Amino acid sequence: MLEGKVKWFNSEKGFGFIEVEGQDDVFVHFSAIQGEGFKTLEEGQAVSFEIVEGNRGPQAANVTKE
Numbered sequence: 001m002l003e004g005k006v007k008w009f010n011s012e013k014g015f016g017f018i019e020v021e022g023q024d025d026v027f028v029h030f031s032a033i034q035g036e037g038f039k040t041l042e043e044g045q046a047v048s049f050e051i052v053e054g055n056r057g058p059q060a061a062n063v064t065k066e
């Protein structure tokens with residue numbers, strides 16, 4: 001599990017990017033967010049996550065707010 005922070009997140013549509021010091025930003029969709037409640041993220045929030053890649057390229061998976 002990787003660690004980073006939310007660079008920005010469009011809460012209306014439910015996507016944004018996670019920034020990771022010294023690595024490429026990682027796209028995050030709301031469907032990757034763990035936990036209860038409305039799935040959303042705020043700029044600057046600390047997260048743990050994994051990167052999942054298929055034919056569409058890499059995105060965040062298993063995103064937990066820390």
Ligand SMILES: [Mg+2]
Nearest residue numbers: 019020022025
């Ligand atoms: Mg950067």
Ligand code: NA
Nearest residue numbers: 035036037039
């Ligand atoms: Na939820």
